[PDB]
Amino acid sequence: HGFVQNIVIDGKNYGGYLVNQYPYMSNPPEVIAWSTTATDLGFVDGTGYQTPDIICHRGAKPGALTAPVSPGGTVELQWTPWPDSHHGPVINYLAPCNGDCSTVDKTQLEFFKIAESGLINDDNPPGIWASDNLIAANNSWTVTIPTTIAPGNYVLRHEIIALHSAQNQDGAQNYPQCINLQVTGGGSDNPAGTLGTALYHDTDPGILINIYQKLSSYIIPGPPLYTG
Ligand SMILES: *[C@@H]1O[C@H](CO)[C@@H](O)[C@H](O)[C@H]1NC(C)=O
Ligand SMILES: O=C(CO)CO
Ligand SMILES: [Cl-]
Ligand SMILES: [Cl-]
Ligand SMILES: [Cu+2]
């Protein structure tokens, strides 16, 4: 359980969608982060992978604001403290807005994977995962926006999948957090995109999995990494 509380770009903080404060207001502020209804700080499980909730979390609506990123620039997402028990991959996707991200129909977004990290070491099962790397970085993740993609407005969909209950059907816990970016630079690629509702299925080999046994490999879920 947790959420993204802050985003660092170009030497400043963009405040996140503080899901334990803003939902409790009739007049919340404008941010780059999407609003959600996930006030339990929880997850979308396999029962929701083909509902709109998987796209940018439960009841999500676009952020009003969009943050500019320098060409090949970094986006640092700062989480609430991630529990060590919640072992799993950290995955990052972009989808183009083809206009202002604030007015997009989330159900039409087509995501391409720009980064993935999974099982890092398995010397002592359940081992050390991308989520443990995030904890070791003081609950921060660094995303480099590719230089080879077409610039424009994009949704960044940044996600932890916790696997501590993933040996039973619909036990994996997805934690997607979306923010609006203005990608800048000289790139041209328009990568093949996947609908949010086709990213994951509740029987995928990296989703329905017992992490407590020795693993020889881990197949990171979702469509193939874009490498440009
Ligand atoms: C994170 O930073 C704090 C100090 O602000 C430090 O005490 C702590 O050990 C750091 N955590 C890790 C895992 O490096
Ligand atoms: O999430 C869990 C308890 O915190 C296990 O399913
Ligand atoms: Cl609730
Ligand atoms: Cl922690
Ligand atoms: Cu949790």
PDB file of C-alpha atoms and ligand atoms in Angstrom:
ATOM      1  CA  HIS A   1       0.000   0.000   0.000  1.00  0.00           C
ATOM      2  CA  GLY A   2       1.260   3.437  -0.979  1.00  0.00           C
ATOM      3  CA  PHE A   3       1.129   6.124  -3.692  1.00  0.00           C
ATOM      4  CA  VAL A   4       3.272   8.734  -5.481  1.00  0.00           C
ATOM      5  CA  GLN A   5       3.432  11.906  -3.341  1.00  0.00           C
ATOM      6  CA  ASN A   6       5.872  14.034  -5.393  1.00  0.00           C
ATOM      7  CA  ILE A   7       7.560  14.220  -8.805  1.00  0.00           C
ATOM      8  CA  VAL A   8      11.002  15.896  -9.322  1.00  0.00           C
ATOM      9  CA  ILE A   9      11.667  17.280 -12.862  1.00  0.00           C
ATOM     10  CA  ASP A  10      14.225  19.967 -13.937  1.00  0.00           C
ATOM     11  CA  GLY A  11      15.155  21.000 -10.359  1.00  0.00           C
ATOM     12  CA  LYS A  12      11.621  21.531  -8.975  1.00  0.00           C
ATOM     13  CA  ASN A  13       8.926  19.536  -7.206  1.00  0.00           C
ATOM     14  CA  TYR A  14       5.518  18.900  -8.862  1.00  0.00           C
ATOM     15  CA  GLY A  15       3.227  17.778  -6.047  1.00  0.00           C
ATOM     16  CA  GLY A  16       1.426  14.462  -6.558  1.00  0.00           C
ATOM     17  CA  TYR A  17      -2.273  13.541  -6.229  1.00  0.00           C
ATOM     18  CA  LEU A  18      -2.324  13.072  -2.407  1.00  0.00           C
ATOM     19  CA  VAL A  19      -5.038  10.402  -2.351  1.00  0.00           C
ATOM     20  CA  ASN A  20      -5.248  10.604   1.529  1.00  0.00           C
ATOM     21  CA  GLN A  21      -6.030  14.388   1.421  1.00  0.00           C
ATOM     22  CA  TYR A  22      -7.497  15.688  -1.861  1.00  0.00           C
ATOM     23  CA  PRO A  23     -10.498  13.252  -2.046  1.00  0.00           C
ATOM     24  CA  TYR A  24     -11.675  14.727   1.331  1.00  0.00           C
ATOM     25  CA  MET A  25     -12.224  18.207  -0.295  1.00  0.00           C
ATOM     26  CA  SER A  26     -15.028  19.713  -2.464  1.00  0.00           C
ATOM     27  CA  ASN A  27     -12.384  22.093  -4.039  1.00  0.00           C
ATOM     28  CA  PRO A  28      -9.012  20.234  -4.506  1.00  0.00           C
ATOM     29  CA  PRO A  29      -5.920  21.724  -6.308  1.00  0.00           C
ATOM     30  CA  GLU A  30      -4.707  21.313  -9.936  1.00  0.00           C
ATOM     31  CA  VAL A  31      -1.690  18.947 -10.292  1.00  0.00           C
ATOM     32  CA  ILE A  32       0.170  16.999 -13.043  1.00  0.00           C
ATOM     33  CA  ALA A  33      -0.935  13.730 -11.343  1.00  0.00           C
ATOM     34  CA  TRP A  34      -4.236  11.996 -12.160  1.00  0.00           C
ATOM     35  CA  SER A  35      -6.969  11.984  -9.452  1.00  0.00           C
ATOM     36  CA  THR A  36      -8.010   8.513  -8.169  1.00  0.00           C
ATOM     37  CA  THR A  37     -10.534   7.134  -5.675  1.00  0.00           C
ATOM     38  CA  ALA A  38      -7.967   4.717  -4.126  1.00  0.00           C
ATOM     39  CA  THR A  39      -8.151   6.295  -0.631  1.00  0.00           C
ATOM     40  CA  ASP A  40      -7.303   2.879   0.925  1.00  0.00           C
ATOM     41  CA  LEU A  41      -3.825   3.433  -0.747  1.00  0.00           C
ATOM     42  CA  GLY A  42      -4.484   0.016  -2.314  1.00  0.00           C
ATOM     43  CA  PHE A  43      -4.403  -1.693  -5.666  1.00  0.00           C
ATOM     44  CA  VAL A  44      -6.130  -3.024  -8.793  1.00  0.00           C
ATOM     45  CA  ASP A  45      -6.020  -6.858  -8.790  1.00  0.00           C
ATOM     46  CA  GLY A  46      -6.665  -9.322 -11.646  1.00  0.00           C
ATOM     47  CA  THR A  47     -10.467  -8.846 -11.334  1.00  0.00           C
ATOM     48  CA  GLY A  48      -9.897  -5.248 -12.612  1.00  0.00           C
ATOM     49  CA  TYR A  49      -7.311  -5.832 -15.419  1.00  0.00           C
ATOM     50  CA  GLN A  50     -10.108  -5.503 -18.078  1.00  0.00           C
ATOM     51  CA  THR A  51     -11.879  -2.558 -16.309  1.00  0.00           C
ATOM     52  CA  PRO A  52     -10.952   1.121 -16.764  1.00  0.00           C
ATOM     53  CA  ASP A  53      -9.471   1.025 -13.229  1.00  0.00           C
ATOM     54  CA  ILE A  54      -6.209  -0.643 -14.453  1.00  0.00           C
ATOM     55  CA  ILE A  55      -5.377   2.346 -16.750  1.00  0.00           C
ATOM     56  CA  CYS A  56      -4.493   5.007 -14.092  1.00  0.00           C
ATOM     57  CA  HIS A  57      -6.001   3.324 -10.926  1.00  0.00           C
ATOM     58  CA  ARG A  58      -9.580   3.254  -9.565  1.00  0.00           C
ATOM     59  CA  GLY A  59     -11.898   6.055 -10.809  1.00  0.00           C
ATOM     60  CA  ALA A  60      -8.940   7.965 -12.254  1.00  0.00           C
ATOM     61  CA  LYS A  61      -9.374  11.312 -14.111  1.00  0.00           C
ATOM     62  CA  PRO A  62      -6.619  13.276 -15.931  1.00  0.00           C
ATOM     63  CA  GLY A  63      -4.491  15.814 -14.064  1.00  0.00           C
ATOM     64  CA  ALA A  64      -5.223  19.395 -15.091  1.00  0.00           C
ATOM     65  CA  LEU A  65      -1.495  20.266 -15.485  1.00  0.00           C
ATOM     66  CA  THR A  66       1.404  18.954 -17.662  1.00  0.00           C
ATOM     67  CA  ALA A  67       5.145  19.107 -16.726  1.00  0.00           C
ATOM     68  CA  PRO A  68       7.783  19.823 -19.431  1.00  0.00           C
ATOM     69  CA  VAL A  69      10.745  17.383 -19.494  1.00  0.00           C
ATOM     70  CA  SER A  70      14.163  18.192 -21.097  1.00  0.00           C
ATOM     71  CA  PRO A  71      15.245  15.927 -23.984  1.00  0.00           C
ATOM     72  CA  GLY A  72      16.369  12.569 -22.505  1.00  0.00           C
ATOM     73  CA  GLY A  73      15.566  14.148 -19.101  1.00  0.00           C
ATOM     74  CA  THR A  74      14.826  12.322 -15.836  1.00  0.00           C
ATOM     75  CA  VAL A  75      11.504  12.117 -13.996  1.00  0.00           C
ATOM     76  CA  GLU A  76      11.923  11.105 -10.282  1.00  0.00           C
ATOM     77  CA  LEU A  77       8.775   9.676  -8.672  1.00  0.00           C
ATOM     78  CA  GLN A  78       8.772   9.748  -4.851  1.00  0.00           C
ATOM     79  CA  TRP A  79       6.509   7.186  -3.124  1.00  0.00           C
ATOM     80  CA  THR A  80       5.208   6.840   0.433  1.00  0.00           C
ATOM     81  CA  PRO A  81       7.383   4.224   2.214  1.00  0.00           C
ATOM     82  CA  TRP A  82       7.086   0.977   0.245  1.00  0.00           C
ATOM     83  CA  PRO A  83       6.714  -2.151   2.420  1.00  0.00           C
ATOM     84  CA  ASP A  84       9.595  -4.648   1.941  1.00  0.00           C
ATOM     85  CA  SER A  85       6.921  -7.459   1.907  1.00  0.00           C
ATOM     86  CA  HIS A  86       5.480  -6.045  -1.359  1.00  0.00           C
ATOM     87  CA  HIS A  87       8.164  -7.604  -3.650  1.00  0.00           C
ATOM     88  CA  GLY A  88       7.696  -7.137  -7.399  1.00  0.00           C
ATOM     89  CA  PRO A  89       8.534  -5.384 -10.636  1.00  0.00           C
ATOM     90  CA  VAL A  90       8.535  -1.630 -11.385  1.00  0.00           C
ATOM     91  CA  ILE A  91       7.322  -0.819 -14.905  1.00  0.00           C
ATOM     92  CA  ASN A  92       6.976   2.433 -16.847  1.00  0.00           C
ATOM     93  CA  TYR A  93       4.827   3.216 -19.931  1.00  0.00           C
ATOM     94  CA  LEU A  94       4.076   6.270 -22.077  1.00  0.00           C
ATOM     95  CA  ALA A  95       0.889   6.917 -24.066  1.00  0.00           C
ATOM     96  CA  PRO A  96       0.518   9.893 -26.398  1.00  0.00           C
ATOM     97  CA  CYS A  97      -2.283  12.399 -25.673  1.00  0.00           C
ATOM     98  CA  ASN A  98      -2.365  13.847 -29.253  1.00  0.00           C
ATOM     99  CA  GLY A  99      -3.570  17.124 -27.637  1.00  0.00           C
ATOM    100  CA  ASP A 100      -3.941  18.343 -24.007  1.00  0.00           C
ATOM    101  CA  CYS A 101      -3.564  15.327 -21.596  1.00  0.00           C
ATOM    102  CA  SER A 102      -6.165  17.075 -19.340  1.00  0.00           C
ATOM    103  CA  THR A 103      -8.989  16.174 -21.831  1.00  0.00           C
ATOM    104  CA  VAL A 104      -7.969  12.606 -22.894  1.00  0.00           C
ATOM    105  CA  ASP A 105     -10.330   9.630 -22.870  1.00  0.00           C
ATOM    106  CA  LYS A 106      -8.225   7.226 -20.773  1.00  0.00           C
ATOM    107  CA  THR A 107      -9.986   4.167 -22.379  1.00  0.00           C
ATOM    108  CA  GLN A 108      -8.426   5.149 -25.816  1.00  0.00           C
ATOM    109  CA  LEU A 109      -4.807   5.545 -24.555  1.00  0.00           C
ATOM    110  CA  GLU A 110      -2.270   3.140 -26.212  1.00  0.00           C
ATOM    111  CA  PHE A 111       0.767   2.544 -23.957  1.00  0.00           C
ATOM    112  CA  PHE A 112       4.297   1.512 -24.901  1.00  0.00           C
ATOM    113  CA  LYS A 113       6.740   0.172 -22.282  1.00  0.00           C
ATOM    114  CA  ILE A 114       9.828   2.437 -21.857  1.00  0.00           C
ATOM    115  CA  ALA A 115      11.390   0.706 -18.836  1.00  0.00           C
ATOM    116  CA  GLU A 116      11.018  -2.452 -16.767  1.00  0.00           C
ATOM    117  CA  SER A 117      12.821  -3.973 -13.816  1.00  0.00           C
ATOM    118  CA  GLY A 118      11.913  -7.327 -12.232  1.00  0.00           C
ATOM    119  CA  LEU A 119      13.693  -9.963 -10.110  1.00  0.00           C
ATOM    120  CA  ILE A 120      17.221  -8.598  -9.416  1.00  0.00           C
ATOM    121  CA  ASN A 121      18.680 -11.388  -7.209  1.00  0.00           C
ATOM    122  CA  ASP A 122      17.264 -14.667  -5.751  1.00  0.00           C
ATOM    123  CA  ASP A 123      20.094 -15.803  -3.368  1.00  0.00           C
ATOM    124  CA  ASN A 124      17.515 -15.767  -0.456  1.00  0.00           C
ATOM    125  CA  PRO A 125      13.921 -16.309  -1.757  1.00  0.00           C
ATOM    126  CA  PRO A 126      11.777 -14.370  -2.159  1.00  0.00           C
ATOM    127  CA  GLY A 127      14.820 -12.319  -3.208  1.00  0.00           C
ATOM    128  CA  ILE A 128      15.522  -8.712  -4.186  1.00  0.00           C
ATOM    129  CA  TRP A 129      13.184  -7.077  -6.713  1.00  0.00           C
ATOM    130  CA  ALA A 130      12.805  -3.729  -8.449  1.00  0.00           C
ATOM    131  CA  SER A 131      10.494  -2.758  -5.493  1.00  0.00           C
ATOM    132  CA  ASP A 132      13.495  -3.387  -3.148  1.00  0.00           C
ATOM    133  CA  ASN A 133      15.700  -1.145  -5.402  1.00  0.00           C
ATOM    134  CA  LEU A 134      12.935   1.534  -4.975  1.00  0.00           C
ATOM    135  CA  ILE A 135      13.098   1.130  -1.151  1.00  0.00           C
ATOM    136  CA  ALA A 136      16.957   1.222  -1.224  1.00  0.00           C
ATOM    137  CA  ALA A 137      16.689   4.562  -3.135  1.00  0.00           C
ATOM    138  CA  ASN A 138      14.635   5.975  -0.178  1.00  0.00           C
ATOM    139  CA  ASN A 139      11.277   5.223  -1.999  1.00  0.00           C
ATOM    140  CA  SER A 140      12.226   6.967  -5.295  1.00  0.00           C
ATOM    141  CA  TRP A 141      12.291   5.732  -8.919  1.00  0.00           C
ATOM    142  CA  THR A 142      14.175   7.479 -11.782  1.00  0.00           C
ATOM    143  CA  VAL A 143      12.649   7.274 -15.327  1.00  0.00           C
ATOM    144  CA  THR A 144      14.722   8.519 -18.350  1.00  0.00           C
ATOM    145  CA  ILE A 145      12.409   9.669 -21.161  1.00  0.00           C
ATOM    146  CA  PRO A 146      13.781   8.253 -24.465  1.00  0.00           C
ATOM    147  CA  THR A 147      15.298  10.733 -26.988  1.00  0.00           C
ATOM    148  CA  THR A 148      14.076   8.642 -29.994  1.00  0.00           C
ATOM    149  CA  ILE A 149      10.263   9.090 -29.523  1.00  0.00           C
ATOM    150  CA  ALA A 150       8.107  11.790 -31.131  1.00  0.00           C
ATOM    151  CA  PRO A 151       7.781  14.739 -28.746  1.00  0.00           C
ATOM    152  CA  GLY A 152       4.342  15.852 -27.575  1.00  0.00           C
ATOM    153  CA  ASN A 153       2.084  15.454 -24.561  1.00  0.00           C
ATOM    154  CA  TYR A 154       2.105  11.967 -22.967  1.00  0.00           C
ATOM    155  CA  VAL A 155       0.689  10.116 -19.964  1.00  0.00           C
ATOM    156  CA  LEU A 156       3.489   8.402 -17.924  1.00  0.00           C
ATOM    157  CA  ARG A 157       1.978   5.308 -16.283  1.00  0.00           C
ATOM    158  CA  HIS A 158       4.369   4.309 -13.480  1.00  0.00           C
ATOM    159  CA  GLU A 159       3.575   1.095 -11.638  1.00  0.00           C
ATOM    160  CA  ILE A 160       4.671  -1.325  -8.859  1.00  0.00           C
ATOM    161  CA  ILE A 161       3.138  -4.864  -8.988  1.00  0.00           C
ATOM    162  CA  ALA A 162       3.352  -6.459  -5.507  1.00  0.00           C
ATOM    163  CA  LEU A 163       3.562 -10.305  -5.678  1.00  0.00           C
ATOM    164  CA  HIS A 164       3.506 -11.321  -1.952  1.00  0.00           C
ATOM    165  CA  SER A 165      -0.038 -12.817  -2.401  1.00  0.00           C
ATOM    166  CA  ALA A 166       0.378 -13.697  -6.139  1.00  0.00           C
ATOM    167  CA  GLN A 167       0.301 -17.518  -5.771  1.00  0.00           C
ATOM    168  CA  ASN A 168      -3.550 -17.377  -5.772  1.00  0.00           C
ATOM    169  CA  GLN A 169      -5.688 -16.194  -8.712  1.00  0.00           C
ATOM    170  CA  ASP A 170      -6.154 -12.355  -8.655  1.00  0.00           C
ATOM    171  CA  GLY A 171      -3.624 -12.104  -5.759  1.00  0.00           C
ATOM    172  CA  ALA A 172      -1.103  -9.839  -7.563  1.00  0.00           C
ATOM    173  CA  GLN A 173      -1.580  -6.133  -6.566  1.00  0.00           C
ATOM    174  CA  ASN A 174      -1.081  -3.487  -9.279  1.00  0.00           C
ATOM    175  CA  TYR A 175      -0.294   0.124  -8.139  1.00  0.00           C
ATOM    176  CA  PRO A 176      -0.435   2.352 -11.254  1.00  0.00           C
ATOM    177  CA  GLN A 177       0.164   6.110 -10.868  1.00  0.00           C
ATOM    178  CA  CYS A 178      -0.272   8.412 -13.909  1.00  0.00           C
ATOM    179  CA  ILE A 179       1.198  11.894 -14.531  1.00  0.00           C
ATOM    180  CA  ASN A 180       1.057  14.254 -17.523  1.00  0.00           C
ATOM    181  CA  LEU A 181       4.364  15.110 -19.329  1.00  0.00           C
ATOM    182  CA  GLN A 182       5.355  17.348 -22.229  1.00  0.00           C
ATOM    183  CA  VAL A 183       8.142  15.353 -23.959  1.00  0.00           C
ATOM    184  CA  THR A 184      10.614  17.639 -25.850  1.00  0.00           C
ATOM    185  CA  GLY A 185      13.421  17.054 -28.393  1.00  0.00           C
ATOM    186  CA  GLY A 186      14.077  15.787 -31.884  1.00  0.00           C
ATOM    187  CA  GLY A 187      12.809  12.144 -31.888  1.00  0.00           C
ATOM    188  CA  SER A 188      10.428  10.595 -34.513  1.00  0.00           C
ATOM    189  CA  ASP A 189       9.429   7.089 -33.288  1.00  0.00           C
ATOM    190  CA  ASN A 190       5.676   6.442 -32.715  1.00  0.00           C
ATOM    191  CA  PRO A 191       5.938   3.018 -31.001  1.00  0.00           C
ATOM    192  CA  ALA A 192       3.175   0.420 -31.294  1.00  0.00           C
ATOM    193  CA  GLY A 193       0.880   0.912 -28.284  1.00  0.00           C
ATOM    194  CA  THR A 194      -1.220  -1.449 -26.130  1.00  0.00           C
ATOM    195  CA  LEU A 195      -4.632  -0.500 -24.597  1.00  0.00           C
ATOM    196  CA  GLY A 196      -4.570  -0.303 -20.770  1.00  0.00           C
ATOM    197  CA  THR A 197      -7.054  -3.238 -20.619  1.00  0.00           C
ATOM    198  CA  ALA A 198      -4.646  -5.446 -22.702  1.00  0.00           C
ATOM    199  CA  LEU A 199      -1.480  -4.840 -20.610  1.00  0.00           C
ATOM    200  CA  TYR A 200      -2.098  -7.727 -18.163  1.00  0.00           C
ATOM    201  CA  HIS A 201      -4.128 -10.928 -17.707  1.00  0.00           C
ATOM    202  CA  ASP A 202      -4.649 -12.580 -14.271  1.00  0.00           C
ATOM    203  CA  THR A 203      -2.857 -15.836 -15.431  1.00  0.00           C
ATOM    204  CA  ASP A 204       0.325 -14.189 -16.833  1.00  0.00           C
ATOM    205  CA  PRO A 205       3.508 -16.026 -15.714  1.00  0.00           C
ATOM    206  CA  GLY A 206       4.841 -12.938 -13.866  1.00  0.00           C
ATOM    207  CA  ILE A 207       1.376 -12.328 -12.295  1.00  0.00           C
ATOM    208  CA  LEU A 208       0.244 -15.798 -11.093  1.00  0.00           C
ATOM    209  CA  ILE A 209       3.463 -16.928  -9.428  1.00  0.00           C
ATOM    210  CA  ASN A 210       4.845 -18.201  -6.086  1.00  0.00           C
ATOM    211  CA  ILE A 211       7.827 -15.863  -5.304  1.00  0.00           C
ATOM    212  CA  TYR A 212       8.683 -17.751  -2.046  1.00  0.00           C
ATOM    213  CA  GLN A 213      10.263 -20.703  -3.957  1.00  0.00           C
ATOM    214  CA  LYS A 214      13.619 -20.453  -5.844  1.00  0.00           C
ATOM    215  CA  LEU A 215      12.944 -18.795  -9.286  1.00  0.00           C
ATOM    216  CA  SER A 216      15.411 -19.401 -12.247  1.00  0.00           C
ATOM    217  CA  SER A 217      13.792 -16.525 -14.218  1.00  0.00           C
ATOM    218  CA  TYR A 218      10.974 -13.950 -13.952  1.00  0.00           C
ATOM    219  CA  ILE A 219       8.970 -12.836 -17.041  1.00  0.00           C
ATOM    220  CA  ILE A 220       8.141  -9.147 -16.404  1.00  0.00           C
ATOM    221  CA  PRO A 221       4.448  -8.684 -17.301  1.00  0.00           C
ATOM    222  CA  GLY A 222       3.108  -6.402 -20.027  1.00  0.00           C
ATOM    223  CA  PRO A 223       3.874  -5.797 -23.683  1.00  0.00           C
ATOM    224  CA  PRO A 224       7.426  -5.791 -25.032  1.00  0.00           C
ATOM    225  CA  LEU A 225       9.952  -3.113 -24.027  1.00  0.00           C
ATOM    226  CA  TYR A 226      10.366  -0.366 -26.651  1.00  0.00           C
ATOM    227  CA  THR A 227      14.159  -0.053 -27.283  1.00  0.00           C
ATOM    228  CA  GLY A 228      14.276   2.517 -30.161  1.00  0.00           C
TER     229      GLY A 228
HETATM  230  C1  LIG B   1      17.311   7.084   3.491  1.00  0.00           C
HETATM  231  O1  LIG B   1      17.734   8.370   4.043  1.00  0.00           O
HETATM  232  C2  LIG B   1      17.740   8.443   5.454  1.00  0.00           C
HETATM  233  C3  LIG B   1      18.070   9.860   5.947  1.00  0.00           C
HETATM  234  O2  LIG B   1      17.234  10.893   5.398  1.00  0.00           O
HETATM  235  C4  LIG B   1      18.751   7.402   5.978  1.00  0.00           C
HETATM  236  O3  LIG B   1      18.732   7.342   7.395  1.00  0.00           O
HETATM  237  C5  LIG B   1      18.326   6.016   5.470  1.00  0.00           C
HETATM  238  O4  LIG B   1      19.225   4.990   5.890  1.00  0.00           O
HETATM  239  C6  LIG B   1      18.213   5.979   3.941  1.00  0.00           C
HETATM  240  N1  LIG B   1      17.639   4.716   3.521  1.00  0.00           N
HETATM  241  C7  LIG B   1      18.307   3.934   2.675  1.00  0.00           C
HETATM  242  C8  LIG B   1      17.680   2.597   2.445  1.00  0.00           C
HETATM  243  O5  LIG B   1      19.348   4.330   2.181  1.00  0.00           O
HETATM  244  O1  LIG B   2      -1.738  -7.119   1.115  1.00  0.00           O
HETATM  245  C1  LIG B   2      -1.741  -7.974   1.964  1.00  0.00           C
HETATM  246  C2  LIG B   2      -1.706  -7.616   3.416  1.00  0.00           C
HETATM  247  O2  LIG B   2      -1.170  -6.331   3.643  1.00  0.00           O
HETATM  248  C3  LIG B   2      -1.740  -9.437   1.636  1.00  0.00           C
HETATM  249  O3  LIG B   2      -2.621  -9.786   0.595  1.00  0.00           O
HETATM  250 CL    CL B   3     -11.998   2.202   0.708  1.00  0.00          CL
HETATM  251 CL    CL B   4      10.128   0.817   3.413  1.00  0.00          CL
HETATM  252 CU    CU B   5      -0.124  -3.159   0.507  1.00  0.00          CU
END
